[PDB]
């Protein structure tokens, strides 16, 4: 507990990126203008969840490796606590050592957020049968997050970086099947002391 692992990640956006407004008030304010709002801050920066993506990446990969990892993604699934993702990301009984911040943007809305027209086309007519409007995050947009691991082990940085490469393969949030969310990660890791603030 005397040491702590700080993992500063910078996510560069390479494809478009849709994440969804979670706030009912912000949705209802924004669904008079756009049908799929982007999750933004009140300080007008884009918010992306990060803990669930890294967790899901690690459970998919470690279930594929054959390691004992419980599937927390099933409905009302209770984590066992005797896992390896349960130590990083928590269980019913022990909090996760890896506190994972949101991916907040360096820039703001109206600099990385753009407002787009999506379509749905009849197959036998080739005409626009439906139209909606979404909000998307442009390419080259930089997001920063910090993962602080409280009781660090050796496998934590490798597991986080692995999970990040799974996100660079699959996607970070939203419509990952139509091409959205393909991003890249740059990692800067350092091992600080816990008594670095105490003067």
Partner 1 sequence: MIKFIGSAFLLETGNAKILIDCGIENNEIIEKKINEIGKADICILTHAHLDHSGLVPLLVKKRKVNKIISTPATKELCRLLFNDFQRIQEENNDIPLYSYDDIESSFEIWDEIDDRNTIELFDTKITFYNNSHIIGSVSVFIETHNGNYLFSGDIGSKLQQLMDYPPDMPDGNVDYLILESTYSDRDRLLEIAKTTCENGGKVLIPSFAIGRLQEVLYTFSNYNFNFPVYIDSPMGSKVTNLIKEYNIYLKKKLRRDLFNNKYIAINTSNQSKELSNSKEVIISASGMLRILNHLEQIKNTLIFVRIEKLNSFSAHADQDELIDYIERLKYTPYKVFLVHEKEQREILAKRIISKKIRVELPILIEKKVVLNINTDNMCNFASYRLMPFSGFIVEKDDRIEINDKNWFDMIWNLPDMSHDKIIENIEYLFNIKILSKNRIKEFWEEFCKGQKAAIKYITQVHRKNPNTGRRNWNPPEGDFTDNEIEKLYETAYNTLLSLIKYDKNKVYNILINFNPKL
Segment 139-168, which members bind partner 1 (CB under 8 A)? none
Cα distance between residue 89 and residue 80, in whole Å: 12
16 binds, among a second copy, partner 1, Zn ion, none (CB under 5 to 8 A by kind): a second copy
Q: Does residue 160 interact with Zn ion by CB under 5 A?
A: no
Dihedral sign, Cα of residue 19, residue 84, residue 154, residue 62: negative
79 binds, among a second copy, partner 1, Zn ion, none (CB under 5 to 8 A by kind): Zn ion
Residues in the chain: 199
Q: Tell me the per-residue interface mask from 23 to 52 with partner 1, x by CB under 8 A, - otherwise.
A: --xx--xx-------------x--------
Q: Does residue 110 interact with partner 1 by CB under 8 A?
A: yes
Identify the residue among 107, 151, 153, 176 touching partner 1 (CB under 8 A): 107
Q: Does residue 169 interact with partner 1 by CB under 8 A?
A: no
Phi–psi pair at 156, nearest 5 degrees: -70, -45
DSSP-assigned beta bridge partners for residue 186? 10
* Between 78 and 188, CB nearer to partner 1: 78
Cα distance between residue 69 and residue 72, in whole Å: 9
Q: What angle do CA 88, 151, 89 make, to 5 degrees?
A: 15
> Quick check: 153 and 5 in contact, CB under 8 A?
no
Tokens of 62: 């470690």
Q: Does residue 62 interact with Zn ion by CB under 5 A?
A: no
Q: Which of residues 80-119 bind a second copy (CB under 8 A)?
A: 89-90, 93-96, 98-102, 104, 114-119
**Using CB under 8 A as the criterion, which residues of the chain lie in contact with partner 1 when the complex forms?**
25-26, 29-30, 44, 74-78, 106-108, 110-111, 128
């Amino acid at each position: 507990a005397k040491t702590m692992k700080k993992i500063y990640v910078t996510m560069k956006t390479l494809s478009p990126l849709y994440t969804g407004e979670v706030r009912r008030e912000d949705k209802e304010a924004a669904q008079k203008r756009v049908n799929f709002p982007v999750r933004k801050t009140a300080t007008n920066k884009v918010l992306i969840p990060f803990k669930g993506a890294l967790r899901s990446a690690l459970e998919i990969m470690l279930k594929a490796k054959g390691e004992n990892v419980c599937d927390t993604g099933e409905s009302r699934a209770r984590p066992c606590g005797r896992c390896v993702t349960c130590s990083l990301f928590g269980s019913m009984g022990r909090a996760g050592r890896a506190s994972v911040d949101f991916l907040i943007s360096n820039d703001t809305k109206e600099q990385i957020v753009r407002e787009s027209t999506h379509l749905r086309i009849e197959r036998q007519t080739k005409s626009a049968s439906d139209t909606f409007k979404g909000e998307e995050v442009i390419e080259g947009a930089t997001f920063t997050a910090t993962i602080t691991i409280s009781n660090p082990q050796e496998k934590d940085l490798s597991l986080i970086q692995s999970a990040l490469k799974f996100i660079e393969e699959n996607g970070i949030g939203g419509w990952l099947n139509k091409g959205y969310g393909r991003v890249s990660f740059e990692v800067k890791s350092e091992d600080v002391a816990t008594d670095r603030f105490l003067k």
